Design a protein around this ligand. Sequence first.
Ligand SMILES: Nc1ccn([C@@H]2O[C@H](COP(=O)(O)OP(=O)(O)OP(=O)(O)O)[C@@H](O)[C@H]2O)c(=O)n1
Ligand SMILES: Nc1ccn([C@@H]2O[C@H](COP(=O)(O)OP(=O)(O)OP(=O)(O)O)[C@@H](O)[C@H]2O)c(=O)n1
Ligand SMILES: O=C(CP(=O)(O)O)Nc1cccc(NC(=O)CP(=O)(O)O)c1
Ligand SMILES: O=C(CP(=O)(O)O)Nc1cccc(NC(=O)CP(=O)(O)O)c1
Ligand SMILES: O=C(CP(=O)(O)O)Nc1cccc(NC(=O)CP(=O)(O)O)c1
Ligand SMILES: O=C(CP(=O)(O)O)Nc1cccc(NC(=O)CP(=O)(O)O)c1
Ligand SMILES: [Zn+2]
Ligand SMILES: [Zn+2]
Lengths: 152, 152, 310, 310, 310, 310
Amino acid sequence: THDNKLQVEAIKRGTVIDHIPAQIGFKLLSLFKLTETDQRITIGLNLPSGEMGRKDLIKIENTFLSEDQVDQLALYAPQATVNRIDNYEVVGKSRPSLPERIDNVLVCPNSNCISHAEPVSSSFAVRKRANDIALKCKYCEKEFSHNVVLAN
Amino acid sequence: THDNKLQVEAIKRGTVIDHIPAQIGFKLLSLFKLTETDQRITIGLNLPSGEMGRKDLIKIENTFLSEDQVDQLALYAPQATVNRIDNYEVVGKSRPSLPERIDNVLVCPNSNCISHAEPVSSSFAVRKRANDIALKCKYCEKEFSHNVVLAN
Amino acid sequence: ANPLYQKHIISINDLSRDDLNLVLATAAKLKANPQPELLKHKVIASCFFEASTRTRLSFETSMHRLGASVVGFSDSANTSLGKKGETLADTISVISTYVDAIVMRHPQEGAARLATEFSGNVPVLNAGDGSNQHPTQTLLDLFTIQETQGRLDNLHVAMVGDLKYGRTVHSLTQALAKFDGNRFYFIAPDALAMPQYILDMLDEKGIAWSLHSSIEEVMAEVDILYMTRVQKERLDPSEYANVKAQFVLRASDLHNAKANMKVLHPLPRVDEIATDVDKTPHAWYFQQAGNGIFARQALLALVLNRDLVL
Amino acid sequence: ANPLYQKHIISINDLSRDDLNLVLATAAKLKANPQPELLKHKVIASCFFEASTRTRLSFETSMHRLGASVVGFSDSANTSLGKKGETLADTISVISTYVDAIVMRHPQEGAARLATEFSGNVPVLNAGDGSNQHPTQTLLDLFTIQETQGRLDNLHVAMVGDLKYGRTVHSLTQALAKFDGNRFYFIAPDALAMPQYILDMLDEKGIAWSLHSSIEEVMAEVDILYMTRVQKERLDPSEYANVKAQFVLRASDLHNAKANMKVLHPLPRVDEIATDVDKTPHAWYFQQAGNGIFARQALLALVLNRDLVL
Amino acid sequence: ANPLYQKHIISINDLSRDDLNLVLATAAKLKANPQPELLKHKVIASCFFEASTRTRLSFETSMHRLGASVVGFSDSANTSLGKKGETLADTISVISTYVDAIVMRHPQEGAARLATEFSGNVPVLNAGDGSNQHPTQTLLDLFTIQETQGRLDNLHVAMVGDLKYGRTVHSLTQALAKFDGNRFYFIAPDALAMPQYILDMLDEKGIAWSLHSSIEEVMAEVDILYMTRVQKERLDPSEYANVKAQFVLRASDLHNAKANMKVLHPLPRVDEIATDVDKTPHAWYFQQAGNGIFARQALLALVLNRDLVL
Amino acid sequence: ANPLYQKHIISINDLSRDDLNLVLATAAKLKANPQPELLKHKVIASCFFEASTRTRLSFETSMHRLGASVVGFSDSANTSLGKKGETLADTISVISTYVDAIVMRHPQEGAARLATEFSGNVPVLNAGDGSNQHPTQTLLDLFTIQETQGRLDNLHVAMVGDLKYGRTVHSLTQALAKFDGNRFYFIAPDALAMPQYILDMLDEKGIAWSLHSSIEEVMAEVDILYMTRVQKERLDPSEYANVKAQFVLRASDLHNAKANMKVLHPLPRVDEIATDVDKTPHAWYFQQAGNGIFARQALLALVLNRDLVL
Ligand SMILES: Nc1ccn([C@@H]2O[C@H](COP(=O)(O)OP(=O)(O)OP(=O)(O)O)[C@@H](O)[C@H]2O)c(=O)n1
Ligand SMILES: Nc1ccn([C@@H]2O[C@H](COP(=O)(O)OP(=O)(O)OP(=O)(O)O)[C@@H](O)[C@H]2O)c(=O)n1
Ligand SMILES: O=C(CP(=O)(O)O)Nc1cccc(NC(=O)CP(=O)(O)O)c1
Ligand SMILES: O=C(CP(=O)(O)O)Nc1cccc(NC(=O)CP(=O)(O)O)c1
Ligand SMILES: O=C(CP(=O)(O)O)Nc1cccc(NC(=O)CP(=O)(O)O)c1
Ligand SMILES: O=C(CP(=O)(O)O)Nc1cccc(NC(=O)CP(=O)(O)O)c1
Ligand SMILES: [Zn+2]
Ligand SMILES: [Zn+2]
């Protein structure tokens, strides 16, 4: 995270989500239910950074993310760095590529969509445009700007 | 303690909510919006504890909790210890004592309660009985077990 | 200003023994010496989000008996206040810029207290909020008991009917438990028994209470026989048929009743009190309903007139 | 007699700048010095062929604040006036033999003016006729603007919402175009853009107006931010979702707003104005609604009292 | 001719243990060996005086799976085939001249029993009569139990929820009491306890039963966990809130369940069974519903055919 | 097994050009060579959560023309098979255990897509889901076009009326964009213009389209004139008056039409096409409706039979 001396230590086996924009760390913990485990997690919020000034850091021991699970962080922490780690060495390091499909976390801004009252998880087809990402709902088949879907 | 095998570091001033039961640290972060600050925060989940196996721990830097605020954790983390750390010195081992009133974080189990789609803050009067805490709604005026109020 | 000037009247648990006595005292005076102009130039909102003809006419009549003007609505089919979907908060916020006091009945518990947080300087009187409170009914019941019994202390009080759901009986019980030495008799089918929380409250205050399955079990020693309407949807038709006699009163059931005994019922009766009871000196339900006027006048008087002239 | 004595108040296009100023002047006086007996002995009909709780209670309260008696009806399920199928003409013909003034709201455009041709010596005040006129709302809006801004001339006025269908904004626009140097900002999704006929009217009168897609585009320089309710059936649910942010206001959107800026909304809000806005000095919609009383009093006063004592 | 040929199917009380087995034995046969033309040429009436989508679609499908035609009505009725007053007797006297069998659902107890007295030679199949019987729902339940457990004897059966008003839990208990060595566990709050008359029938037959407060208490011993819907439209919202949260089934509760254990529910389940249970192997409510087609086909075939060669 | 065997028919977007032809090729075959026993023994559910007489009768007739039985409901529903809260998911999990295929119409977008996730091995045919899809209406449209024009390539297609909200004009455009060299003419007022996303899809595929203000402008070049109904329940009465009068088709407008030109309308036509058009040879809306039976039979037969020898 560009800094040393007074921070959160390193682990042996697991994943470390680094360079998370400030105020996005907690959101990632919620949205993707990351604390919903027995493994040991360590979090640093509003940590000083050389590059970003400040950022969040998530460390999850004995847990790994597929390249696709990594891409799901694309709409929230696109400049993030996901670090794969075994025997204290950064075995792997990857960054979020915006996915072609986003499940479970978003909700169809369409109030008449069938997805809302129902025991189904949301799902959107992702496709880029000049100034944004277009999100198309699997059910309503309506497409919305990621700015509408993401907003409250 | 369990703070120095690998360093989660020790902070100067602020509070150190310690001895939070497993899977409760995250709730506290949510229900009470603890991450909505710019202060440096460091969380540890499922850390080891000699007297319960695992535990959680929050470190909001240079930010203190009143007498009541600390009592607001009692319903979620009763056998938990808050610490009013002053320049590296643990100066005050407080502890959640059941409050008389619980505001904002609870939801009235009563579906007919006026409180639900209205711009008001929930409010419950607390009291021990058979020891299971009966929670009484300011609006509804109905009383339920903390286990029905808390279920959802 | 009197103790109740500009105060909200949401629950009977917010009123003290002195407050009640104050309302009844005032009620007596108004009953005796009418003040038709007392609230002249006041405009009161009669807000029945939940329709209720007898309570609304009683309240509104009380309003006019004091000289105040009235605006309002009944059975709000949809929302009410520029019908649509706005919050109750917003509805009260607006109506409180128009009136001097708001009297409201609502199907949701809490409604009257919520209105309190948006009404500003405007007092709200709860005419009924779901299965929670109904303070003006208790005040009229209390007034009727005290006037016919001469007191509210050391009384033998029987409550028959749906003790489980009826908010009036819960409310009346608590109000009477603010007075010393009252003795209670709860006659109800166990499926509609008086809640365990009302019994605890009475245990703590050290009040005598017993359960009975028949009116004749205690008829001989009650001062007030308070009957309630047993909601028929509550029960299965056959179930209701099998317990029906437990809570119905006839003229013949009054053979060993004390002379002083009066029968009250918040109405409607029809399924509980036979019409042959009406002609006996014990029937006091219509008189009781009449007393809602003096109790409701007293209340508006106290809340809206700082210096009450009596 | 004053300019408006015994006149009908059907449209804002029938009122002159002097007439408006007259209403507001009177409104101010009544707000300041109440005349509770001014219309004593007058009987006014509150005729809501179309239900509308907030407008009816506002109007009726205004009526009682002046001392007049009221008769009327709401939501005429069927016809109304010996229910059946008679004409509106006949209904007004009869009711005008009973009352001193008729206030009416109707779902059909033209209703208030038609009533005018059958009411005889009885004035009718239009409380709303389909998507046509709503003069008393504009008068209260105008009163609110002038009181908080000190004037009706040279103002920076923003109108947000359903500029296409909302009769209030069309009406308010025209009334303000009777005053000099007002500057308009129309923020609306093109599907609900301000009609071409309102823009022409302003072109001819040489008035400055511009179209914007966001409130923040002009937030920094508006004196009055007039929000409207966007009818949800107007749009497709997904359509409505995609434009929804264009016309919704939050407390944070007010960061660079002028101190003097007030937010108005004829109500109901709920989908356009977040509740965190209520606590800021800019929120003025509930105050605005309160001013409907003084504007409505002024109006009845002027129309029914030949020699207005102030 | 089979024992059920031309017999009415009105009440579980009228059906013997042998009658029960016959029906289940035929249902297993038809399930394995469909006879799509068996009732070819037969016209059956689907008379739902009380609307009932699931039951009616289930019954009607069974009818078609055997090749019969169907005529009928589902009403939520306004005296269907009455006209402000025609008796159910006359409407059955008419319809029994049209069809080969009458399947009917009605809001009043005894309705089907009355029909058999006016349908002559036409069999009457009761699809539900008020709070009395629902014999076919019990046949499909018993079939589901026999098929998944391989027997209707020596079972551990837990029935959870509203045992007081649930007519299906009452019939299932009665039906199971016709077999030997079954043990019942009743999980219900006190307000919805399994009725004393049911408990009296079991005691009187040497059948053991017990009351328990949660499912965890019986889970390890249960073969069939029968969940029933809470007639919430009967309780106070607050009341339904306290009880609900207790007798709700989550997947995790099934951690210690036996491998043969099946979760049944006449449906709709909404607040009683969490959707994560659906994926477990114990979830068998949809399968139970699908079995209503074989239970109902069997019943129809047995009543309309002298002898079946299946 | 054909490409459509056991496949769900939810969206026009999911169907390829080959899928389209297969359906039209089978519909022509069945129209010429009826197979009344093809689906004999199959039971199909006709589930109209949203009432729809024309569509339902059309679908149900198709079902019977192939010999299948039908069960279902048309509701204008009060949570049909829900009871204040059962999910559409559970009602499909039940029904898919009863029938061989589910035909459903629902007011919410995505409803049919959700059903396929709970119907297991039972195919789901979408008969309309809110403002999203209506694939079978497009198949019958395309069949009518192919049959009267002999192709779905190189056509001149004018679509008139409400292009903004019409889901059928959106699907027809999308479907036709799967073929080559078609040219579209869109005649609509600005408030109801064909959406930009549709125009973007065409631009993006090299398909030419143009906007015109009247039918006279395109008449001489048009092969298929597709009229759509104005969702008038969306506009102001005045507004609907101005636009209506423009985009109405009279017989005289067809003076210069080509001999092969056909007028189509999903119906109901009421204000859009004058009855004197009905007698002209171009009038083909009734014929189009009749073709819904062959389009729908094809669809059913392809989904339920591995291979058809027609
Ligand atoms: N066993 C380890 C090893 C590394 N880390 C953390 O994961 C990141 C690894 O960074 P590093 O491999 O040292 O490369 P950097 O210098 O951080 O550059 P970059 O962040 O771009 O990879 C740092 O936050 C480090 O503290 C850890 O938690 N446990
Ligand atoms: N400057 C400091 C001082 C203390 N702590 C934290 O305060 C908590 C409690 O420390 P302390 O009460 O001094 O000793 P313990 O053994 O942890 O107390 P207990 O037995 O109650 O856990 C530990 O998480 C310790 O890391 C901290 O974060 N920064
Ligand atoms: O006389 C009244 C008031 P009204 O019928 O609304 O005029 N009784 C009343 C009003 C509102 C609620 C209740 N609730 C009760 O439990 C009393 P009951 O069951 O006897 O009507 C009782
Ligand atoms: O506050 C009011 C009057 P009320 O809701 O009838 O009490 N607004 C009102 C009344 C009647 C019509 C309209 N029409 C509008 O276009 C204003 P909006 O769309 O904001 O309600 C607005
Ligand atoms: O709403 C329904 C579906 P319907 O029978 O088609 O009306 N209820 C229904 C359907 C089938 C069986 C049952 N069985 C019951 O026991 C009804 P409950 O549990 O509500 O008393 C209940
Ligand atoms: O009212 C009807 C008949 P229904 O489908 O049987 O409900 N409408 C209907 C029927 C068949 C097809 C269509 N097609 C449409 O495009 C409906 P619209 O043009 O109103 O959006 C619409
Ligand atoms: Zn959607
Ligand atoms: Zn509540």
